[PDB]
Structure 1
């Protein structure tokens, strides 16, 4: 369970992401795909992309970036009271998309990497610790829901 102080560090760096969610989502997905190429296979619409240039030019990858960060943003803003937001998400990612928790760990890593690079103003060690806490919470609660749904994760 995060403190209010920890939530405010999360939400301060989020506020910067929101200046340009599409740009941040491009960087974050590209980092994910570069770091764990196996994750790209889950995206039938753009899993053929071969290079970072291709990725940066893909309108479909850009939309996905906006989707993930907007959904995550809405979750973070709930400050742990995210049961409603996680229901649909766990169901789709468990049952349709088939995303293991380890891939949720991979995108969490990419999120932290990009924020650390982009936002040294709002992503010092304390803020990064708070964001890691929030993302662990997210992954813990998703994992519990996956189990409920019958998915090993």
Structure 2
């Protein structure tokens, strides 16, 4: 579990993300798609996009980034009590979207890179450590639901 002090490091930096959800969501998805091109192939909506410049120009991608970060924020703010929020997400990601757990690890790494670029002063090693723990918790709970339903392990 995270301590109360580690949750406070997480949510302090997240309040800052909430100043510009759309810009954050962009940088994260672009970083994901460039670092791990195979992830872009999951998105019928985005697979036509070939360059970073086309990505940065897509309003629909920016819209999806807000969808993603809003759902994540609602989970973080539950500070681990996130069962009701996380269940619907794991079901759709397992059964509809077919998203490997490994891809959730990839987007976690994208999230941490972008927070580090945008908020150095609020995102030192101790906050980075806390955020890494929160994302691990998120992945571990999703992984449990996947296993239940019989999805890739």
Instruction: State the match for 1:15 in structure 2.
Output: 15
C-alpha distance in 2 between matches for 1:136 and 1:45? 28
Structure 1 position 149, deviation (Å): 1.5
- For 1:19, what is the secondary structure of its paired residue? coil
Question: Could you tell me the TM-score, scaled by structure 1's length?
Answer: 0.98
Listed as ranges, the matches of 1:63-74 within 5 Å are 63-74=63-74
Q: Could you report, residue by residue, the CA deviation over 1:42-92 in whole angstroms, capped at 9, with x for unpaired residues?
A: 110111100111101111110110011100000000000001011110000
Unpaired segments of 5 or more residues in structure 1? none
C-alpha distance in 2 between matches for 1:32 and 1:115? 14
Q: Could you report, residue by residue, the CA deviation over 1:70-123 in whole angstroms, capped at 9, with x for unpaired residues?
A: 000000000000010111100000000000000000000000000011100110
Unpaired segments of 5 or more residues in structure 2? none
C-alpha distance in 2 between matches for 1:126 and 1:149? 35
Question: Could you tell me the TM-score, scaled by structure 2's length?
Answer: 0.98
Instruction: State the match for 1:96 in structure 2.
Output: 96
Instruction: State the match for 1:59 in structure 2.
Output: 59
C-alpha distance in 1 between matches for 2:10 and 2:44? 32
- For 2:151, what is the secondary structure of its paired residue? coil
